[PDB]
Amino acid sequence: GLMQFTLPVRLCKEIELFHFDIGPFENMWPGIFVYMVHRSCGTSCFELEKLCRFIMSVKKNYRRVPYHNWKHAVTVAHCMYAILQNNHTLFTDLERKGLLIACLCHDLDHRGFSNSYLQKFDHPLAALYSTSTMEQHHFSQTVSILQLEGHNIFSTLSSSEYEQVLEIIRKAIIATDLALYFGNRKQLEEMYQTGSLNLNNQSHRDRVIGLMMTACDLCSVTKLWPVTKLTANDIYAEFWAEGDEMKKLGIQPIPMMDRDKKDEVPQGQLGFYNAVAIPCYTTLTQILPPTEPLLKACRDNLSQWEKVIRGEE
Ligand SMILES: Cn1ncc(C(=O)N2CCOCC2)c1C(=O)Nc1cc2nc(-c3ccccc3)cn2cc1C#N
Ligand SMILES: [Mg+2]
Ligand SMILES: [Zn+2]
Numbered sequence: 001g002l003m004q005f006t007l008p009v010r011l012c013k014e015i016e017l018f019h020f021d022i023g024p025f026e027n028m029w030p031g032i033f034v035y036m037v038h039r040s041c042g043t044s045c046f047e048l049e050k051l052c053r054f055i056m057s058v059k060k061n062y063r064r065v066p067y068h069n070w071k072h073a074v075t076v077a078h079c080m081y082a083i084l085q086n087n088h089t090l091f092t093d094l095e096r097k098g099l100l101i102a103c104l105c106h107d108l109d110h111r112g113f114s115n116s117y118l119q120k121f122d123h124p125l126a127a128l129y130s131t132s133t134m135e136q137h138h139f140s141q142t143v144s145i146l147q148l149e150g151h152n153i154f155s156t157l158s159s160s161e162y163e164q165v166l167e168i169i170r171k172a173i174i175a176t177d178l179a180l181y182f183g184n185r186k187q188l189e190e191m192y193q194t195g196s197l198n199l200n201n202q203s204h205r206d207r208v209i210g211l212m213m214t215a216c217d218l219c220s221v222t223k224l225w226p227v228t229k230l231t232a233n234d235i236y237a238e239f240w241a242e243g244d245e246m247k248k249l250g251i252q253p254i255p256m257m258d259r260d261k262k263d264e265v266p267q268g269q270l271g272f273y274n275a276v277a278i279p280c281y282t283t284l285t286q287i288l289p290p291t292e293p294l295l296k297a298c299r300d301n302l303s304q305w306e307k308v309i310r311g312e313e
Contacts, residue, residue, distance in 0.1 A: 004038060005034045005035040007031070011032070015032065015036070016082070018219075018222055020078060020082070022071065029071070029074045032074060034051065041097055050153045053150050055104070057151055058105055058108065058145060062107070062110070063110065066241075067112070067231070068111075072107060074104070077216075078219075080100055080103040087290060087291070094165050094168065098165045098169050098172065102168065102173055103216055106213070108137075108142060109138070109141045112238040112241060112242070113134075114134075114242060117246065118134070132180065134177075135174050135176055139173045143166070172209055175209065175210035178217075184214070191207075192286050211287070212284065218277055218280060220235070221272075223301075228301045236259075239256055243256075266305055266308045270306070273298065273305065278298055278302065282295055
């Protein structure tokens with residue numbers, strides 16, 4: 001009860017900012033996550049013994065892949081923490097509980113390959129789940145870990161609150177399927193413009209929570225340029241490995257995944273910021289004004305990629 005987590009002074013201050021980097025010390029990441037749960041939700045939301053045992057089980061079930069790893073999980077949870085803390089009153093007690101856990105779990109047991117590669121490989125998960133393949137697997141892995149003896153951090157909820165939180169987590173994890181983001185943001189754009197957007201409408205909250213997940217998932221583009229740039233190396237390290245595997249199946253990969261087309265990466269990043277990142281944080285800032293520092297950090301990083309193209313770096 002009376003046991004808070006405290007961070008060193010630099011982390012204590014910088015963790016509140018959207019652009020915070022969780023640092024290279026793996027052993028501090030669980031404490032960082034616990035700290036965020038305590039300030040975001042309360043010292044009471046979760047039994048510390050159960051929470052700690054859930055975090056270490058989730059960590060264990062992330063693989064040693066260049067990008068879709070335990071550091072990504074905690075990074076994405078931190079961005080969600082920053083959105084929730086800057087939008088205090090807009091979110092229920094349950095949503096704050098569910099969304100930090102959703103973020104921590106959203107890439108559980110990722111192998112470093114896209115849904116496309118699973119399908120073309122004919123991976124068993126592609127038979128079990130025809131769309132949002134990895135994302136249905138991540139939610140499946142989340143429910144499995146929650147059901148390990150001593151791991152049910154939600155045990156103190158009523159049957160109905162329990163079903164509500166697992167439903168928030170499921171929609172939230174599915175929403176991290178980027179193929180669904182485009183349509184989700186279009187509908188949110190229409191609803192905000194025509195003025196029909198209603199945060200009491202559960203189907204409208206769903207869409208908004210979905211956009212928050214896309215925004216947290218893509219948050220490497222909202223960091224200081226050196227974080228953004230070094231994370232991009234890890235992203236391409238997975239992409240190019242998948243391209244290699246595509247070539248093994250006798251399929252020429254898309255240029256994104258062809259290490260032979262490294263040259264075109266800066267232009268590929270412009271497409272990404274314009275097609276995906278900028279629209280995401282724009283609609284998000286329209287709906288949740290205090291998330292504007294994400295849009296501003298994203299535009300700064302678009303500007304940095306433009307400077308790479310122009311040979312200036
Ligand atoms: C920064 N960032 N953060 C998240 C993601 C991302 O998408 N994730 C989905 C999957 O998991 C990893 C996170 C990216 C990203 O870089 N995305 C893209 C890069 C890219 N390069 C080229 C390109 C590169 C070279 C040549 C031609 C095209 C195309 N192209 C499309 C992209 C998209 N979308
Ligand atoms: Mg994912
Ligand atoms: Zn992710």
